[PDB]
């Protein structure tokens, strides 16, 4: 229907197909020093098992932790306001957004930002590229660009990855741990792994709807990110709970028609784990910092 929650489910479901493309994934391996992430993951893996108290194994999980770190440090950059092309100094945001010229539209930028230099009387352009192939080159932006490119990257290394859309304007990634038989919170943008209460408890965020999107599924993952489910419920005033559920089921069932029997069975076995967590809200936690 006309509710915007449902309209974003469909773009995002569409949009997330782009990562699975070994053409783009190829392009995203050109960028990534696996040999080094994967070899630094093994060195942290060998030593961790000296204190075998450390249960699980973790392995592609140690690599996951190197993946985030690399991304934060060597690869992607955070854009506050971009520096002036001319003089190299401070710029400020004009609220009237630039119209995207032409190339910018091609690489998926609908909104372009005016980063004004007062010194130079120069409008600098901060395009807001939806297209992850452009982000491999631009290598910068805010949470949108960071989650969007980091999700292409997970897939690029054979990770099961979701794009996770929070209604209150943050986005991130989920990554499956074969190791731990569960999905894992990944915020490259904030350098955090497997600390889902970062947003509500760390930031004081008043959450509502958080929807995950992968090649296989759409999942309402809201309940992973909260221990105040009653308050979250109160803010879920955008759409009927029936209609949201109906619509994600519809989408999963349509888009699972072309999966295998056993695959579909693996999925239903995992969804039990998630669903149990969603009814197992945590007890409200200083450091979601450090």
């Amino acid at each position: 229907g006309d509710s915007t929650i449902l309209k974003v489910l469909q773009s995002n479901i569409q949009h997330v197909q782009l990562y699975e493309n070994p053409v783009l994934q190829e392009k995203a391996l050109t960028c990534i020093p696996v040999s080094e992430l994967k070899r630094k993951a093994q060195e942290k893996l060998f030593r961790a098992r000296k204190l075998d108290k450390g249960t699980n194994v973790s392995d592609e999980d140690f690599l996951l932790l190197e993946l985030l770190h690399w991304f934060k440090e060597e690869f992607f950059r955070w854009v506050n306001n971009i520096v002036c092309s001319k003089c190299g100094g401070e710029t400020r945001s004009r609220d009237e957004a630039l119209l995207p010229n032409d190339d910018e539209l091609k690489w998926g930028a609908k909104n372009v930002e005016n980063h004004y230099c007062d010194a130079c009387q120069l409008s600098n352009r901060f395009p807001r590229y939806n297209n992850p192939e452009k982000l491999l080159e631009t290598r910068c932006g805010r949470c949108g660009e960071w989650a969007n490119c980091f999700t292409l990257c997970c897939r690029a290394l054979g990770f099961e990855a979701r794009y996770v859309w929070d209604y209150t304007d943050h986005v991130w990634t989920e990554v499956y741990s074969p190791s731990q038989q569960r999905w894992l919170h990944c915020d490259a943008c904030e350098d955090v792994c497997d600390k889902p209460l970062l947003y509500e408890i760390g930031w004081g965020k008043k959450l509502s709807y958080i929807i995950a999107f992968s090649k296989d599924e759409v999942v309402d993952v809201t309940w992973r990110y909260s221990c105040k489910h009653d308050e979250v419920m109160s803010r879920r005033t955008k759409v009927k709970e029936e209609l949201l559920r109906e619509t994600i089921n519809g989408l999963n069932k349509q888009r699972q028609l072309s999966l295998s029997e056993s695959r579909r069975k693996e999925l239903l076995q995992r969804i039990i784990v998630e669903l149990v967590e969603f009814i197992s809200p945590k007890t409200p936690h200083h450091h979601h910092h450090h």
């Binding site: 309940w223 879920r236 709970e241 089921n249 784990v273 669903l275 149990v276 969603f278 009814i279």
Partner: protein
Amino acid sequence: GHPLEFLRNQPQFQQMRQIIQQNPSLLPALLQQIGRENPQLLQQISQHQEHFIQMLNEPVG
């Protein structure tokens, strides 16, 4: 009308019910998984097992 009544119309439970009604074979694995994630919920489930099961098998659209 039990300790577990509050789960009845929670969204994530309504989804759990649709799945369990359409995948009965998953009940043991559910009970087991709840046993890991949520020891105190598994216990309240045990105190009042039929109530819980009636919740799970009640149809929801």
